Design an enzyme around this catalytic site. Structure first.
Site, PDB file in Angstrom:
ATOM      1  N   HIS A   1     -24.690   4.682 -19.791  1.00  0.00           N
ATOM      2  CA  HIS A   1     -23.394   5.267 -19.485  1.00  0.00           C
ATOM      3  C   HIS A   1     -23.135   6.381 -20.530  1.00  0.00           C
ATOM      4  O   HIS A   1     -23.987   6.634 -21.401  1.00  0.00           O
ATOM      5  CB  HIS A   1     -22.344   4.158 -19.520  1.00  0.00           C
TER       6      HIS A   1
ATOM      7  N   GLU B   1     -18.846   9.418 -29.865  1.00  0.00           N
ATOM      8  CA  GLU B   1     -18.316   8.227 -30.540  1.00  0.00           C
ATOM      9  C   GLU B   1     -18.804   8.238 -31.978  1.00  0.00           C
ATOM     10  O   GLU B   1     -18.004   8.174 -32.891  1.00  0.00           O
ATOM     11  CB  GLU B   1     -18.797   6.982 -29.774  1.00  0.00           C
TER      12      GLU B   1
ATOM     13  N   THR C   1     -18.934  -0.717 -28.356  1.00  0.00           N
ATOM     14  CA  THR C   1     -17.792   0.177 -28.661  1.00  0.00           C
ATOM     15  C   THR C   1     -16.728   0.032 -27.599  1.00  0.00           C
ATOM     16  O   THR C   1     -15.718   0.772 -27.647  1.00  0.00           O
ATOM     17  CB  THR C   1     -18.235   1.651 -28.701  1.00  0.00           C
TER      18      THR C   1
ATOM     19  N   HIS D   1     -20.051   8.704 -22.914  1.00  0.00           N
ATOM     20  CA  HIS D   1     -18.651   8.832 -23.416  1.00  0.00           C
ATOM     21  C   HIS D   1     -18.379  10.302 -23.666  1.00  0.00           C
ATOM     22  O   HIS D   1     -19.294  11.036 -24.113  1.00  0.00           O
ATOM     23  CB  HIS D   1     -18.468   8.119 -24.761  1.00  0.00           C
TER      24      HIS D   1
ATOM     25  N   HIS E   1     -14.402   2.988 -16.522  1.00  0.00           N
ATOM     26  CA  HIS E   1     -14.485   3.304 -17.968  1.00  0.00           C
ATOM     27  C   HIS E   1     -15.528   4.395 -18.295  1.00  0.00           C
ATOM     28  O   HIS E   1     -15.503   4.930 -19.398  1.00  0.00           O
ATOM     29  CB  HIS E   1     -14.813   2.083 -18.860  1.00  0.00           C
TER      30      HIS E   1
ATOM     31  N   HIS F   1     -25.221   6.475 -23.983  1.00  0.00           N
ATOM     32  CA  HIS F   1     -25.637   5.153 -24.510  1.00  0.00           C
ATOM     33  C   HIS F   1     -26.670   4.540 -23.575  1.00  0.00           C
ATOM     34  O   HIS F   1     -26.382   4.403 -22.354  1.00  0.00           O
ATOM     35  CB  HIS F   1     -24.415   4.256 -24.698  1.00  0.00           C
TER      36      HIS F   1
END
Ligand code: ENN
Ligand code: ZN
Length: 258
Positions: free
Chosen positions: A91, A103, A196, A93, A61, A116
């Site tokens: 991590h 995000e 999220t 995104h 992910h 994050h």
């Protein structure tokens, strides 16, 4: 199992995690004209031990840097938080395009990516897993990445990406000076929200930093070569792993600054 592909992506998460349609979901649109400055918020106070990082992995992910959270070597304090929140994992995104990857979105601007930094309330709960289930359990620091010069502080991470191509791969990873990756201003917005990603629990005090850090387009593209598939599963690439914005539902977004 959940992901960001057509049949398992964000629109379908409500199928297996009903809290996806809750009243405290993340991420959100931050409309600065509706943000309330709050003079009672405190400054962030951060201590990140570079020895705390142990392993970087492909979760399927994102990449996940796991930190040893045996005690309080690395903590976040202050901000909107009561007490001390212990560092767990980092991590990132992104999206398939460099101008639509973050995000959180600020006055309609999506950044290229969003980092994050996930922490948990060890002053009140005995473990990450227990804290993740309480409304004051978790604090995530959100850092935007904007396309610019290459960022040497991201080199340590990007040099490992080839070794963790397939979902489940991991590589020892320590001496990561996470402090030095953050922007020089720690002014922030804050609101009560959620994970999220599934299980989407409404246990997160979001602290989103106003100031982005830079990343080059070529650095960012490396992340898209990660797979959301494991060794011997038909390959699919993690070209985008950001959830769309969720309704604010009358929550207050507050600013540490004005
Ligand atoms: C391998 C496990 C699944 C991946 N989960 C996450 O990366 C994760 C994300 C957030 S986020 N995107 O809300 O910061 C939080 Cl708060 C907590 C977790 Cl555990
Ligand atoms: Zn995240």
């Amino acid at each position: 199992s959940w992901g960001y592909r057509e049949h398992n992506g964000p629109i379908h998460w409500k199928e297996f995690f009903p809290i996806a349609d809750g009243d405290q979901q993340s991420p959100i649109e931050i409309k600065t004209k509706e943000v309330k400055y709050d003079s009672s918020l405190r400054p962030l106070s951060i201590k990140y031990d570079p020895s705390s990082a142990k392993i970087i992995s492909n979760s399927g992910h994102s990449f996940n840097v796991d930190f040893d959270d045996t005690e309080n070597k690395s903590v976040l304090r202050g901000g909107p938080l009561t007490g001390s929140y212990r560092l767990r994992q980092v991590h990132l995104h992104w999206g398939s395009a460099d101008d639509h990857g973050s995000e959180h979105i600020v006055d309609g601007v999506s950044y290229a990516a969003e980092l994050h930094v996930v922490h948990w309330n060890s002053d009140k709960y005995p473990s990450f897993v227990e804290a993740a289930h309480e409304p004051d359990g978790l604090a995530v620091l959100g850092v935007f990445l904007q396309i610019g010069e290459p960022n040497s502080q991201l080199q340590k991470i990007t040099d490992t990406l080839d070794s963790i191509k397939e979902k489940g791969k991991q590589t020892r990873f320590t001496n990561f000076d996470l402090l030095s990756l953050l922007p020089p201003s720690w002014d922030y917005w804050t609101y009560p929200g959620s994970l999220t990603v599934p299980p989407l629990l409404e246990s997160v005090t979001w602290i989103v930093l106003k100031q982005p850090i830079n990343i080059s387009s070529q650095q960012l593209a490396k992340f898209r070569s990660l797979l959301c598939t494991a060794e011997g599963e038909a390959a699919a690439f993690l070209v985008s792993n950001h959830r769309p914005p969720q309704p604010l539902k009358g929550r207050k977004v507050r600013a540490s600054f004005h």
